Amino acid sequence: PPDLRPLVPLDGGRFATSDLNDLYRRVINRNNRLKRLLDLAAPDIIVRNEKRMLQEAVDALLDNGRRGRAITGSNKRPLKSLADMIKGKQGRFRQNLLGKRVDYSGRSVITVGPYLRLHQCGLPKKMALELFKPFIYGKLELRGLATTIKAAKKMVEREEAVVWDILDEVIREHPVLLNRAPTLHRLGIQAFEPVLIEGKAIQLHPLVCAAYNADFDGDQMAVHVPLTLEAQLEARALMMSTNNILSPANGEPIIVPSQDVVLGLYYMTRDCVNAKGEGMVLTGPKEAERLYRSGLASLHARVKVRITEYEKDANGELVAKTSLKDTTVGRAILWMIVPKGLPYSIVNQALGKKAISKMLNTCYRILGLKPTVIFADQIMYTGFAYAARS
Amino acid sequence: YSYTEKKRIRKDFGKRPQVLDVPYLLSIQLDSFQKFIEQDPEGQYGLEAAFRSVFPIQSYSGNSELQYVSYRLGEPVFDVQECQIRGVTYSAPLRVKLRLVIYEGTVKDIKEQEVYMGEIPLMTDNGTFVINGTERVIVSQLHRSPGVFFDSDKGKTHSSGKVLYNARIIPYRGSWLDFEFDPKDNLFVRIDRRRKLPATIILRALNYTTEQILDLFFEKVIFEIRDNKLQMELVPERLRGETASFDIEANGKVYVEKGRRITARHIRQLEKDDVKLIEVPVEYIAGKVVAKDYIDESTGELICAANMELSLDLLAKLSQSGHKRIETLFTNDLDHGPYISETLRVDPTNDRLSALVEIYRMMRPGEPPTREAAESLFENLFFSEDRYDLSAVGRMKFNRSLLREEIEGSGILSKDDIIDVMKKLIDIRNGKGEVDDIDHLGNRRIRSVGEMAENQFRVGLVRVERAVKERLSLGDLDTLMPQDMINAKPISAAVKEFFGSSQLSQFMDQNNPLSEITHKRRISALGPGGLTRERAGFEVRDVHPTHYGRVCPIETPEGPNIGLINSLSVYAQTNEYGFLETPYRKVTDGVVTDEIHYLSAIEEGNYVIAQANSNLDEEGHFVEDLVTCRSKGESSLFSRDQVDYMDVSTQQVVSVGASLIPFLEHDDANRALMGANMQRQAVPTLRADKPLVGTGMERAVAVDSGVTAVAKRGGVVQYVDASRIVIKVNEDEMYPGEAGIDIYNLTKYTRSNQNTCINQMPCVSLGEPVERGDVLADGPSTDLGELALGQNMRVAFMPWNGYNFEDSILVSERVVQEDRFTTIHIQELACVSRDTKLGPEEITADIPNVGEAALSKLDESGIVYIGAEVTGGDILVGKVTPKVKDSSLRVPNGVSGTVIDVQVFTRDGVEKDKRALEIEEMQLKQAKKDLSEELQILEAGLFSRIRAVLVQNQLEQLAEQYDELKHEFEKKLEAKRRKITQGDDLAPGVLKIVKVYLAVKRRIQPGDKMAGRHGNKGVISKINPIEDMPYDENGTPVDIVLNPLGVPSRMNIGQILETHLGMAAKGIGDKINAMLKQQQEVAKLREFIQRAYDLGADVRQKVDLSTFSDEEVMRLAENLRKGMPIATPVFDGAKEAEIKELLKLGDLPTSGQIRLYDGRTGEQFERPVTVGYMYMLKLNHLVDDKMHARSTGSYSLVTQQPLGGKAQFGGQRFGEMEVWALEAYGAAYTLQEMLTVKSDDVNGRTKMYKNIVDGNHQMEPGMPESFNVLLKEIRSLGINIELED
Amino acid sequence: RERMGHIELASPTAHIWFLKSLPSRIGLLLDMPLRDIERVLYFESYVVI
Amino acid sequence: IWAAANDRVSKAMMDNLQTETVINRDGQEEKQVSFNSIYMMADSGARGSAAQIRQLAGMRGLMAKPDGSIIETPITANFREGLNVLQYFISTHGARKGLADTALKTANSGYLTRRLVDVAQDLVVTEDDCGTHEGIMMTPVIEGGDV
Amino acid sequence: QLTMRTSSIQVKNKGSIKLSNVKSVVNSSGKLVITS
Amino acid sequence: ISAASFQETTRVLTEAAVAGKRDELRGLKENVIVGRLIPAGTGYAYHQD
DNA sequence: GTACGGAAAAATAACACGGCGAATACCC
DNA sequence: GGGTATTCGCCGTGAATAAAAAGGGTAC
RNA sequence: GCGUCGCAGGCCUUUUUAUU
RNA sequence: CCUGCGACGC
Ligand SMILES: [Mg+2]
Known part of the structure; x- marks a missing residue:
């Protein structure tokens, strides 16, 4: 059909031709020459060469390059036949069927968001206004502020005050699909909740950078917007970052802390043989935090803190105990981050990287999935807080 | 010290003295185009060789001949400044004088006239080419040198690990002739990688019989027959490596018994015995191979053929016939292998004609074989000058591999050349020989602009002479001139194809002078006839030991082409044949001399060269007993009285871009590669900022590039302005006739190739003495003649709340408020008004169906005003098309800016509008002022001469000279006005083209890519306020907070040394500024600056302030109040102890770490942090050009x-x-x-x-x-x- | 974009997919080598029927 | 002997970097773990390993050739003090080899991943228990040195 | 993360050996040879 | 369909033309081409219901 | 300045590895 | 002379995207 | 809340650079 | 056939 091989116009006025149109023109011209020569009762020698040229023209139209030499026109390059549009990387399968270009998508440079949670990300307002056009149009037509769709389009293009309120209303519980360019496994496309920020960069959580394998030296990521209820439920239940905490290749976690968090938790949980406030009895972790923030006790000082740890060794219920531990000031401050089900022997040592990894493993093994996300978020928060004070 | 360097002297660390100045960096392409474009006799390089290899032209026995006499280049109609603003090619007309003769012999009439054959583009003095207004750079090519090569299969084929050898002859132009082996030990030959054939076929094709073939490749063993006992000739060297199956008997003495191994003591006994005739039984003769045939003088029959095994019946047949001497072949397993014998046994052909038929069937498949056609095909492969040709370098590399004394010869091959190649391949297979490396720089040439332009001109000339011969075949003479036979179409077509659309003809990166000076000095292994970027291999991508001083190892792009795109070194040059060379100081036995010698890659392996940084006793001897040197691709410790040469400098290994990184030896090679790659991607800001920690090569980049205004003749500056600089030339450099002044028109705000702004700002004052070579205007990324690629700010290495998590960078708000990273980007929007059917197009402002709010910005001519802040969706050029429909030019959505310049190009027949008249009036006013300056200078001089003669025919003579000068100036003004109103060419069917330029200022924002000089890149995450940044006890906040986590993992320690040195330099600058802020005298300031310059141990700077005046010391102090620049060399850099002394010179601690207080809370940090100054750079990876979003839009036609x-x-x-x-x-x-x-x-x-x-x-x-x-x-x-x- | 046309050839032609793609479908059905069919189709040899 | 010298240099550097402290408890000194930033960033597992500290403080050691062999003259200096030209030109071989290997591995990795996906795209869990008795015998793999 | 470019045994600890798939014959010196 | 979309489309389509193959989807890649729910995850429950 | 589109010179150009099928040469 | 069985051609394969130019019919 | 009139657009191949 | 623009009817 002619729409599958069109003749495009140019600015100069000359209509440029394609490869298939040239091959079809060659085949039709050779067939017309053969018919005109057969009408005039030619001898066999000329019509044998004419039938041979028609055979070569048909073979060049079907698959140019198999038999003989591929014909070149004005470019010293082989022409495209009907078989070149099906096979190869630029065929209809790998370029138009297996991988396509989709709507409701964007792309920007990623940055770091320390204040974000594990299930949310920072989305710019200039991208959220473009990716959520018909939702804002439907909400403006429902609220009655714009009866005509052209009035709603002009209200969005003018960027009025209620447009940002509608955009904040249609984004609160609508997830987006963030994706990096090399997708080696299934953790390269995760779902997050958009947070309207000011700027042109995407704020990414620091804990998902190990799963994404993306630092912040110029990396870019693509966003996608689900529209149907089934797609939103598949993003919330299957593709959410809080649901993918174990790798399906071997079972190891993918929410391991990076260098700044383990550096802060290593500097906080250490001790020296002589410091300010060494050798005093403390009544709890709140007095340790008060003595650290008041400037009367160092972060590395061997003290005696009365702790209250819980243990769930019974049939589901938790049993409490109270004793005097020989610990430091920073480990008591980190003990407020640790939940009730975990013991005290996992925090009384110097926290490296595998120690925090096995701490998160023990928390996910004993408590479950829901406190583990809050524990990892609070660990990242206190690591970023105590790496700056050092 | 010149007038430019005396304004601000950079402190130069380093202990090694410089015995050779840094040469012109862009001299390679300039010298290549000068060798291509100049007039040179004796048939050497240039256009003369191309004209002599083609002319004279002979006809098919028509008694006619068209020969070449001389050529002459024309003058360009426009210079480089006008072809860029008009859009034409800066070329020159080629005028060649030919001569046509005719015979009946003798001649009867000679026709000589000038023939015009195309135009060739000229090279700018900066080293670029203007094709269509844009500047292009022709990249040099790195290909294999022509000659012969021997390689090894290394055991990949046959799955047994057997090593197979091969030989290939690669000409400069012609077919390939490759020789290969077999695991069954059979020599094969293939032409152009086709089906292989035995080498005896191409041997018999060269008129060779079997006897001559066995004579050339094998020795003769005389087997004579005596009366009895079967004597034979014995050579004692032939029995080495062979067992003794029989008893060797001669003259009754026993030498080696049966079943005994031959030891060298028995060989020495055979030497001492002097015998050559032993007894051999009958069973040993049947294992030999006969050499030639034997015929009977009485019978006349063929007993045995050549190259066959011997048997007892044929031995009896030679016994009865009376053949005394029998010639056989010597066959061994270590030194002489029977490869040609098995090659003859495999080959079924036994004639020259059958060999020609097989060659014709191999080269022409599916063709009827003919003897004359095969004779014409085999002669036109390696023996015809037109199809096959070897250059002088190809003949040199061919004769050097075969151990020949002569290096001259013909371009075609011969029989003895192929015989010597096969002999060398056989000796390599036997063991006497070795293969050579393909990666060796002695086997790789370097092409340039002139050689490829000469090749394309030769292709155009052979097409022209083909057309001339075809036009001379059909026609007559004595009625025409030699102008219609010469067609200037294929020459111009080949020249425009080479210069417009080629793999090596690409746009020049115009964002930095460093990017231009590295793109011009670029060596690429790809291109036409080169390699492929995806199918290169591991062995061609690594760095060779012969790349020392010739190819930079740390300057190559990372990605698909690693090691295929190399950069030229600083002191590296090109030989006469096309090979790389580096200077070496000649070291005699008495003293290390200073005479340099350019050694090639082959000459480097013969001598031994000491290290670059080897300390001496300042007289010319080595203070160490053993010094590290190199002899043949390896480093070792050698004696004192063993060296022959020495490196001329310590910067000859790195390139120009790699020598701008201070403390390069303290960084890893990967981080240095990333820093050298990212140093070319910087964008110039509003104001340039000098680096506090530099090297000293910044002035060479700023001067050798064409971004600054270098004064051609020294003198006194007469008139200073932001757009022009007038220089009054002194009488010492003035010409004796028509003395005048120099006018430098500065290049203001315009668009470059990378949509950036290039601008020249003046740096001189009124009445300032300048010299020849001093700069007058500072271009983009240039500060007082140096290279200023970025800004230097107060830096700190500490984590700040996870805002520098992986690579992120925390920038303060004072960096944004001072606008020190604001860049200007200029776009170009064109509006082509073409001529079509149903009437033409007009640019009238009356646009239908639009309100007057859109037409408020348009003038009466229909073009938007200059200086109107337009946005997305505004009409710039109002254009309508008759069916009237609207086709005006509008601003696309998302872009905006300010209209700064409008260029209108019209045809000769179309009447110009008011805007083109205003542009031509402004250009005529500028030309009128530029002529009137010299006019009033000459008028003042002539009136001074009138007053001199005054206090009567001399007055009439001077008045006639005054009227002659006025007429000459009127003629020059009319010529300039005609050159202005000459017109511009356009496409066929195009009436006029209007171009609109939009300028915008893009500030810094979170999302932009920042980097340094040590491979430390990052993206800004948050712009912090000034009250939240950490501060010291004095209250000075930090501008940029970096993360120290990347320092142990990515090993780049040079950034911390640069931080400490910049902190010391800023401390010296703040001490100078504190001394200058209060009312201080000149003596204390002078002795403080002298004490600051005298710091260092055994430095070679030696600045003495006794020769400086008080105004010069005050100007130097005002230039040093922002910081003292420090030149830290590449490998001769400053040590840590000198940084300690420089920190003790100020009020700063030696450790470089100070305590900081928090800005949010106010408490002191527990540990001191490293606070200093780091030269940062802003790359061309901004976030506003990468953010994109889409809900709905347009779709395609074929696939929706x-x-x-x-x-x-x-x-x-x-x-x-x-x-x-x-x-x-x-x-x-x-x-x-x-x-x-x-x-x-x-x-x-x-x-x-x-x-x-x-x-x-x-x-x-x-x-x-x-x-x-x-x-x-x-x-x-x-x-x-x-x-x- | 869905309607097609046709070209009535004056002489029959062989399909290159069922001939050149190894193994040849015409060469295996007729039990003939590919070179002889290439000689017959491109007018270089005769064949008796 | 150069490998033994490099091992002794690394051992002396690690022994100098472990304690690095003479601090008084009440009036007498006592050794403790160092609070150096390099040792704290290399010991906690944040960024960098022991080989990075060996190349930053001790000698770099033996370096290989592009042909595959090892140069007998090693790099007796680190990145803290000044390297010469030969010790940089030696390390450029390994840097270029690593960069070329990283640049050329990705096409083969993508081709292998594409072939594995297209050969294993039609295996979906459809049942719960087919009722079979076949199976493989799980044993720990032993090569001869250790498990 | 992978790569692309190209007489006597000693025990580690104390334990009894287990010889499987071996056919032997007792010699005169008291050693143990393998005929498999 | 899955054999032609991966590699060697010409010989696979030639064998499918000379064999007369009837291709049920029964998989992921065939359902990707025609644009429907794949038999995996929620699409498996859709195919079951 | 409108009109058949081919094949022979072009002073053409020239990858490594692997699987499958056909011409052809050994071995009784 | 039938059954092998090495050789030698030939076809298929060689990661994934964003910007910026240049050319879309040359002859007699 | 839609329909009628007019304008602009839907490409292909090759080369170069940059990023992951 | 799909987008964006300008105009008009009930
Ligand atoms: Mg990155």
């Missing part, structure tokens, strides 16, 4: 899919890996929505849009259109595929 790209408002591509990641989940509805509704289904996406607008989240799957296109395309191939139901 969204478009691709930001400029077309396209969408992102959901590739196959994202589909696999969605299939790895249970997300089936999301993949169905991505594949059908969001991409393909038109009815599905319209129903989905209507449902989302109405408020329903429900979709219909439908059928994708791409599957229907696939079904229609498979169905057109004659295959029936359909969906059944």
Whole structure:
């Protein structure tokens, strides 16, 4: 059909031709020459060469390059036949069927968001206004502020005050699909909740950078917007970052802390043989935090803190105990981050990287999935807080 | 010290003295184009060789001949400044004088006239080419040198690990002749990688018999027959490596018994015995091979043929015939192998004609064989000058590999050349020989602009002489002139094809002078006749030991082409044949001399060269007993009285871009590679800022590039302005006739190739003495003649709340408020008004169906005003097309700016509008002022001469000279006005083209890519306020907070040394500023600056302030109040102890770490942090040019899919890996929505849009259109595929 | 974009997919080598029927 | 002997970097773990390993050739003090080899991943228990040195 | 993360050996040879 | 369909033309091409219901 | 300045590895 | 002379995207 | 809340650079 | 056939 091989116009006025149109023109011209020569009762020698040229023209139209030499026109390059549009990387399968270009998508440079949670990300307002056009149009037509769709389009293009309120209303519980360019496994496309920020960069959580394998030296990521209820439920239940905490290749976690968090938790949980406030009895972790923030006790000082740890060794219920531990000031401050089900022997040592990894493993093994996300978020928060004070 | 360097002297660390100045960096392409473009006799390089290799032209026995006499280049109609603003090619007309003779012999009439054959583009003095207004750079090529090479299979084939050798002859132009082996030990030959043949076929094709073949490749063993006992000739060297199966007997003495091994003591006994005739039994003779044939003088029959085994019956037949001497062949297994014997046994051909038939059948498949056709084909392969040719370097490399004394010869091959190549291949196979490296720089040449231009001119000239011969065959003479035979179409076509659309002809990066000076000095292994970037291999990408001083190892792009795109070194040059060379100081036995010698790659391996940084006793001897040197691709410790040469400098190994990194030896090679790659991507800011920690090579980059205004003649500055600088030339450099002044027109705000702003700012004052070579205007990224690629700010290395998590950079708000990273980007919007049917197009301002609010910015001519802040969706050039329809030029959505310049180009027949008249009036006013300056200077001089003669024919003579000068100036003004109003050429069918330029200022923001000079890149995450940044006890906040976590992992310690040295330099600058702020005298300031310059141990700077005046010391102090620049060399850099002394010179601690207080809370940090100054750079990876978003838009025609790209408002591509990641989940509805509704289904996406607008989240799957296109395309191939139901 | 046309050839032609793609479908059905069919189709040899 | 010298240099550097402290408890000194930033960033596992500290403080050691062999003259200096030209030109071989290997591995990795996906795209869990008795015998793999 | 470019045994600990798939014959010196 | 979309489309389509193959989807890649729910995850429950 | 589109010179150009099928040469 | 069985041609394969130019019919 | 009139657009191949 | 623009009817 002619729409599958069109003749495009140019600015100069000359209509440029394609490869298939040239091959079809060659085949039709050779067939017309053969018919005109057969009408005039030619001898066999000329019509044998004419039938041979028609055979070569048909073979060049079907698959140019198999038999003989591929014909070149004005470019010293082989022409495209009907078989070149099906096979190869630029065929209809790998370029138009297996991988396509989709709507409701964007792309920007990623940055770091320390204040974000594990299930949310920072989305710019200039991208959220473009990716959520018909939702804002439907909400403006429902609220009655714009009866005509052209009035709603002009209200969005003018960027009025209620447009940002509608955009904040249609984004609160609508997830987006963030994706990096090399997708080696299934953790390269995760779902997050958009947070309207000011700027042109995407704020990414620091804990998902190990799963994404993306630092912040110029990396870019693509966003996608689900529209149907089934797609939103598949993003919330299957593709959410809080649901993918174990790798399906071997079972190891993918929410391991990076260098700044383990550096802060290593500097906080250490001790020296002589410091300010060494050798005093403390009544709890709140007095340790008060003595650290008041400037009367160092972060590395061997003290005696009365702790209250819980243990769930019974049939589901938790049993409490109270004793005097020989610990430091920073480990008591980190003990407020640790939940009730975990013991005290996992925090009384110097926290490296595998120690925090096995701490998160023990928390996910004993408590479950829901406190583990809050524990990892609070660990990242206190690591970023105590790496700056050092 | 010149007048430019005396304004601000950079403190130069380093202990090694410089015995050789840094040469001109862009001299390679300039010297190549000078060798190509100049007039040179004796048939050497240039256009003369191309004209002599073609002319004279002979006809087919027509008694006619067209020969070449001389050529002459014309003058360009416009210079470089006008071809860029007009859009034409800066070329020159070629005028060649030919001569046509005719014989009956003798001649009867000679026709001589000048013939014009195309135009060739000239090279700018900076080293560029103007093709269509833009500047291009022809990249040099790195290809294999012509000659002969021997390689090894290294055991890949045959799966047994057997090593196979081969030999190939690569000419400069012609067919290939490759020789190969067999695991069955058979020598083969293949031409142009076709089906292989035995080498005896091409031997017999060169008129060789079997006896001559066995004579050339084997020795003769005389086997004579005596009366009895079967004597034979014995050579004692032939029995080495062979067992003794029989008893060796001679003259009754026993030497070696039966079954005894031959030891060298028995060989020495055979030497001492002096015997050559032993007894051999009959069973040993049958294992030999006969050499030639034997015929009977009485019978006359063929007993045995050549190259066959011996038997007892044929031995008896030679015994009865009376053949005394029998010639055999010597066959061994270590030194002489029977390869040619098995090659003759494999070859079924036994004639020259059959060999020619087989060669014709191999080269021409499917063709009827003919003896004359095979004779014409075999002669036109390696023995015809037209089809085959070897250069002088090819003949030199061919004769050097075969151990020949002569280096001269012909371009075609011969019989003895192929014989010597086969002999060398046989000796390599036997063991006496070795293969050579392909990666060696002595086997690789370097092409340039002139050689490729000469090759394209030769292709054009042979097409022209083909057309001339075909026109001379059909026609007569004595009625025409030699102008119609010469057609200037193929020469101009080949020249425009080479200069316009080529793999090595690319645009020059115009964002930095360093990017230009590294793109011009670029060596590429790709191109026509080179390698391929995806099929190169591991062995060609690594760095060779012969790359020392010739190819930089740390300057290559990372990605698809690593090691294929190399950069030239600083002191590296090019030989006469095309090989690389580096200078070496000649070291005699008495003293290390200073005379340099350019050694090539082959000459480097013979001598031994000491290290670059080897300390001496300042007289010329080595203070160490053993010094580290290199002899043949390896480093070792050598004696004192063993060296022959020495490195001339310590910067000869790195390139120009790699020598701008201070403390390079303290960084890893990967981080240095990343820093040298990212140093070329910087964007110039509003104001240039000098580096506090530099090297000293910045002035060479700023001067050798064409970005600054270098004064041609010294003198006194007469008139200073922001657009022009007038220089009054002194009488010492003035010409004796028509003395004048120099006028430098500064290049103001305009668009470069990378959509950036290039601008020249003046740096001189009124009445300032300048010298020859001093700069007058500072271009982009240039500060007082240095290279200022970025800004230097107060830096700190500490984590700040996770805002510098992986690579992120925390920038303060004072960096944004001072606008020190604001860049100017200029775009170009054109409006082509073409001539079509139904009347032409007009640029009238009366545009229908638009309000007057859009026409308020347009003038009466229809063009937008200069200086109007336009936005997205405004009419710039009002254009209508008669059917009237509207086709005016509008601003695209998303871009904006300010109109700064409008250029209007019109044809000769079309009447110009008011804007073109205003532009021509402004250009005529500028030319009138530029002529009137010299006019009033000469008028003042002539009136001074009138007053001199005054206090009567001399007055009349001077008045006649005054009227002659006025007439000459009027003629020059009329010529300039005619050159202005000469007109411009356009495309056929185009009336006029109007171009609008938009300028915008892009500030810094979170998302931009920042980097340094040590490979430490990052993206800004948050712009922090000034009250939240950490501060010291004095209250000075930090501008940039960096993360120290990347320092142990990525080993780049040079950034911390640069930080400490910049902190010391800023401390010295703040002490100078504190001394200058209070009222201080000149003596204390002078002695403080002298004490600051005298710091260092055994430095070679030696600045003495006794020769400086008080105004010069005050100007130097005002230039040093912002910081003292420090020159830290590449490997001769400053040590840590000198940084300690420089920190003790100020009020700063030696450790470089100070305590800081928090800005948010106010408490002191527990540990001191490293606070200093680091030269930062802003790359061309801004976030406003990368952010894109799309809900709905346009779709394609064939496959109903969204478009691709930001400029077309396209969408992102959901590739196959994202589909696999969605299939790895249970997300089936999301993949169905991505594949059908969001991409393909038109009815599905319209129903989905209507449902989302109405408020329903429900979709219909439908059928994708791409599957229907696939079904229609498979169905057109004659295959029936359909969906059944 | 869905309607097609046809070209009535004056002489029959062989399909290149069922001839050149190894193994040859015409060469295996007729039990003939590919070179002889290439000589017959491109007018270089005769064949008796 | 150069490998033994490099091992002794690394051992002395690690022994100098472990304690590095003479601090008084009440009036007498006592050794403790160092609070150096390099040792704290290399010991906690944040960024960098022991080989990075060996190349930053001790000698770099033996370096290989592009042909595959090892140069007998090693790099007796680190990145803290000044390297000469030969010790940089030696390390450029390994840097270029690593960069070329990283640049050329990705096409083969993508081709292998594409072939594995297209050969294993049609295996979906459809049942719960087919009722079979076949199976493989799980044993720990032993090569001869250790498990 | 992978790569692309190209007489006597000693025990580690104390334990009894286990010889499987071996056919032997007792010699005169008291050693143990393998005929498999 | 899965054999032609991966590699060597010409010989696979030639064998499918000379053999007369009837291709049920029964998989992921065949359902990707025609644009419907794959038999995996929620699409498996859709195919079951 | 409108009109058949081919094949022979072009002073053409020239990858490594692997699987499958055909011409052809050994071995009784 | 039938059954092998090495050789030698030939075809298929060689990651994934964003920007910026240049050319879309040359002859007699 | 839609339909009629007019304008602009839907490309292909090759080369170079940059990023992951 | 789909987008965006300008105009008009009930
Ligand atoms: Mg990155």
